[PDB]
RNA sequence: AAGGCGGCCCCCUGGACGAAGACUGACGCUCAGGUGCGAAAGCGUGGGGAGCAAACAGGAUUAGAUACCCUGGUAGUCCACGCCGUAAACGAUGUCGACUUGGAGGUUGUGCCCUUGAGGCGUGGCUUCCGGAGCUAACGCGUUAAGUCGACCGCCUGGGGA
């Protein structure tokens, strides 16, 4: 219904959940998929295989725009950093750019307290 | 007497207004026994990162030997003028007269 | 003696992400290492070197 | 320990 | 402390020649002009307790040097106390 | 000096250290009261408010949860103006000076040298880790002493009460 041919993947990687989101070069979002609704809850949500089907199911909702060259923006220190990049090539794309976009403050705010266990 | 290196960059849409600001600021310095050592115009120059939603900033490098009369007024008229977007002064070790590495390659 | 204007010297002393390489890797003197730090911080205000590889 | 300290105040016998 | 024109002149004011720079009366005048230089600074900068340590050092240094000339020759002592405005 | 002190730039200002000499001539050391500085919490008046976060709100945990964990959240943290002057304010070593084998380094200078390289050779300031003699209850210290000595001051006298 529309042709952009230039993808940008702002993928998220937290300790609890990994979120794959396809967008364009100009901020207009094209589709998202979270590992919470992908049949993975709680401890199953914090699995690298949950990021393997989240990237594939998000890619199946953005092939209506005919994207062939996409950019990968990895954001977060969470696990699943490898399972979501290989899954984009499993969806039949031409992987071009991979860039870590993890936000690093310059000691802006004070971090929270410890979690002693 | 102090030795200053004065760095100020000009808004790129008023790049033709630069030689006016060169000789108006100079006459107030040299009248109060202020020397001058380096005056180099560089033109437009590509930025490492965008500032004030702009690109291709104009760069002018200076060296001014003058007493503390000019250090009060010249930094205020930089903040008063909207053409200069960044103003930076620094104290050096001696009166120096040497071409920049920007001029020696361009 | 060291100066901020010669950016070709400063390109050899930074990373691709704009991080300052310490004197452990390059093996430079500790007198210049404090001076090279403030010389980049002069050039970082003057938009000559990028902060991060983000922008 | 100093003799000159004991000029001001001697050793306090309990 | 001061520049070269303020330092070398006061040595020539109270010294017998240009070489008379190590004497005690010059050292009083080097501290007298310095405390008089810092009168308006500490009024504006009462929260600068670290430079006040340098100020209280020089007040204590001037008091010890006035005690040397007073115990040896009071004729040179009575000259300098009114010539710089001391004894309050 | 210590608590401490960290984007850059300007202004004001403090001490420290080195080289070459010139110059005053013991002008010094030390310190009971006195005097000032002095982490953070908290207190007074008036601002300020992101984030974090006593009390507290709510949900899990549980025998109960008051704590832990999580979602929020006020005082406070910020600034001005004061007051408060206590800390595991610790190098758990008061300050100053004189000497007594040495290494691995760091930092900061300076003097000379086929400059024959940012090097060779010396030589002060600061600082850490080893270690001989010596000391020590042991641990360890060991040219920055807790080695051998001097000058002066503080402080302790079984534990608990305190
Ligand atoms: Mg100085
Ligand atoms: Mg003599
Ligand atoms: Mg209160
Ligand atoms: Mg809680
Ligand atoms: Mg308050
Ligand atoms: Mg106590
Ligand atoms: Mg210890
Ligand atoms: Mg032994
Ligand atoms: Mg040892
Ligand atoms: Mg008792």
Swiss-Prot record, chain A:
InterPro entries given for it?
Ribosomal_uS11 (IPR001971), Ribosomal_uS11_bac-type (IPR019981), Ribosomal_uS11_CS (IPR018102), Ribosomal_uS11_sf (IPR036967)
User: Is Lyase one of the keywords?
Assistant: no
Looking at the UniProt entry, the stretches that span the membrane are: none
Q: Name one GO biological process term.
A: cytoplasmic translation
Kindly give the Pfam families that the UniProt entry links to this protein: Ribosomal_S11 (PF00411)
Question: Gene3D superfamilies of this UniProt entry?
Answer: Ribosomal protein S11 (3.30.420.80)
Lyase recorded as keyword: no
UniProt GO molecular function: small ribosomal subunit rRNA binding; structural constituent of ribosome
Its keywords, alphabetically, are:
Methylation, Ribonucleoprotein, Ribosomal protein, RNA-binding, rRNA-binding
**Could you state one GO cellular component term attached to this entry?**
cytoplasm
Further remark, if any?
A: Has been predicted to contact the N-terminal domain of IF-3 based on footprint studies; exactly how IF-3 interacts with the 30S subunit is controversial.
The family assignment reads: Belongs to the universal ribosomal protein uS11 family.
State its role. Answer: Located on the platform of the 30S subunit, it bridges several disparate RNA helices of the 16S rRNA. Forms part of the Shine-Dalgarno cleft in the 70S ribosome.
Q: How does it assemble?
A: Part of the 30S ribosomal subunit. Interacts with proteins uS7 and bS18. Cross-links to IF-3. In stalled ribosomes contacts ribosome rescue factor SmrB.
Query: Can you name this protein?
Result: Small ribosomal subunit protein uS11
Name of encoding gene? rpsK
Swiss-Prot record, chain B:
Has UniProt tagged this entry with the keyword Ribosomal protein?
yes
Task: Tell whether RNA-binding is among the UniProt keywords.
Answer: yes
Highest taxon of source: Bacteria
Provide any one GO MF term from the record. Answer: structural constituent of ribosome
What post-translational events are described? Answer: 5 different forms of the protein, varying only in the number of C-terminal glutamate residues, were isolated. The sequence shown is form bS6-6, which is the longest. The first two Glu are encoded by the rpsF gene, the other Glu are added post-translationally by the RimK enzyme.
Q: Which residues carry this modification: N6-acetyllysine?
A: 93
Q: Which GO terms describe its biological process?
A: cytoplasmic translation
Write down any Gene Ontology CC term.
cytosolic small ribosomal subunit
Q: Give the keywords, sorted.
A: Acetylation, Ribonucleoprotein, Ribosomal protein, RNA-binding, rRNA-binding
Q: Where is the chain membrane-spanning?
A: none
Subunit info?
Part of the 30S ribosomal subunit. Interacts weakly with uL2 in one of the 3.5 A resolved structures.
Family per record: Belongs to the bacterial ribosomal protein bS6 family.
Query: What's this chain's function?
Result: Binds together with bS18 to 16S ribosomal RNA.
Q: What is this protein called?
A: Small ribosomal subunit protein bS6
Covered residues of the complete protein? 1 to 106 of 135
From Swiss-Prot, chain C:
Sorted alphabetically, the keyword list is: Acetylation, Ribonucleoprotein, Ribosomal protein, RNA-binding, rRNA-binding
Q: Does the keyword Transcription apply?
A: no
Q: Which GO terms describe its biological process?
A: cytoplasmic translation; translation
Q: Which GO terms describe its molecular function?
A: mRNA 5'-UTR binding; small ribosomal subunit rRNA binding; structural constituent of ribosome
Which pairs of positions does the record mark as disulfide bonds? Answer: none
Q: Its quaternary structure?
A: Part of the 30S ribosomal subunit. Forms a tight heterodimer with protein bS6.
Concerning its family, UniProt says: Belongs to the bacterial ribosomal protein bS18 family.
What is this protein's name?
A: Small ribosomal subunit protein bS18
Lineage of producing organism: Bacteria, Pseudomonadati, Pseudomonadota, Gammaproteobacteria, Enterobacterales
Relative to the complete UniProt sequence, the shown stretch is: 20 to 74 of 75
From Swiss-Prot, chain D:
Q: Which residues cross the membrane?
A: none
Any idea what job this protein has?
Answer: With S4 and S5 plays an important role in translational accuracy. Interacts with and stabilizes bases of the 16S rRNA that are involved in tRNA selection in the A site and with the mRNA backbone. Located at the interface of the 30S and 50S subunits, it traverses the body of the 30S subunit contacting proteins on the other side and probably holding the rRNA structure together. The combined cluster of proteins S8, S12 and S17 appears to hold together the shoulder and platform of the 30S subunit.
Subunit structure, interactors included: Part of the 30S ribosomal subunit. Contacts proteins S8 and S17. Interacts with ArfA. May interact with IF1 in the 30S initiation complex.
Question: Any remaining note in the record?
Answer: At least 19 substitutions or deletions in 11 codons can promote streptomycin resistance, dependence or pseudodependence; all but one of the streptomycin resistant mutations (K42R) are associated with hyperaccurate translation and thus reduced translational efficiency. The streptomycin sensitive allele is dominant to resistant alleles.
Q: In which family does this protein belong, per the annotation?
A: Belongs to the universal ribosomal protein uS12 family.
Q: What is this protein called?
A: Small ribosomal subunit protein uS12
The organism named in the record is: Escherichia coli (strain K12)
Q: What residues of the intact protein does this structure contain? A: 2 to 15 of 124
């Amino acid at each position: 219904r529309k042709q952009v041919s230039d993808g940008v993947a702002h993928i998220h990687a937290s300790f609890n959940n990994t979120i794959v989101t396809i967008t364009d070069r100009q901020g207009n979002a094209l589709g998202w998929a979270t590992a919470g609704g992908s049949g993975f809850r709680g401890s199953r949500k914090s699995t690298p295989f949950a990021a393997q089907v989240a990237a594939e199911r998000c890619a199946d909702a953005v092939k209506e725009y005919g994207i062939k060259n996409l950019e990968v923006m990895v954001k977060g220190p969470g696990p699943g950093r490898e399972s979501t990049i290989r899954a984009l090539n499993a969806a039949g794309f031409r992987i071009t750019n991979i860039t870590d976009v993890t936000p690093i403050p310059h000691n802006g705010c004070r971090p929270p307290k410890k979690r002693r266990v | 007497m102090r030795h200053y290196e004065i760095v100020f960059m000009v808004h790129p849409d008023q790049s033709e207004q630069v030689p006016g600001m060169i000789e108006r600021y100079t006459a107030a310095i040299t009248g109060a026994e202020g020397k001058i050592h380096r005056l180099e115009d560089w033109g437009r120059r590509q930025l490492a990162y965008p500032i004030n939603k702009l690109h291709k900033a104009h760069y002018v490098l200076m060296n001014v030997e003058a007493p503390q009369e000019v250090i009060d007024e010249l930094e205020t008229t930089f903040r008063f003028n909207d053409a200069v977007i960044r103003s930076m002064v620094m104290r050096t070790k001696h009166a120096v007269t040497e071409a920049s590495p920007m001029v020696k390659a361009k | 003696e060291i100066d901020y204007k010669d950016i070709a010297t400063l390109k050899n002393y930074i990373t691709e992400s704009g991080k300052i390489v310490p004197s452990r890797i390059t093996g430079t003197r500790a007198k210049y290492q404090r001076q090279l730090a403030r010389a980049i911080k002069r050039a970082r205000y003057l938009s000559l070197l990028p902060y991060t590889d983000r922008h | 320990a100093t003799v000159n300290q004991l000029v001001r105040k001697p050793r306090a016998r309990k | 402390s001061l520049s070269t024109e303020a330092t070398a002149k006061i040595v020539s004011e109270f010294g017998r020649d240009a070489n008379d720079t190590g004497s005690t009366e010059v050292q009083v005048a080097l501290l007298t002009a310095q405390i008089n230089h810092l009168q308006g600074h500490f009024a504006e900068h009462k929260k600068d307790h670290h430079s006040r340590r340098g100020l209280l050092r020089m007040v204590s240094q001037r008091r010890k040097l006035l005690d040397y000339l007073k115990r040896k020759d009071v004729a040179r002592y009575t000259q300098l106390i009114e010539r710089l405005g001391l004894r309050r």
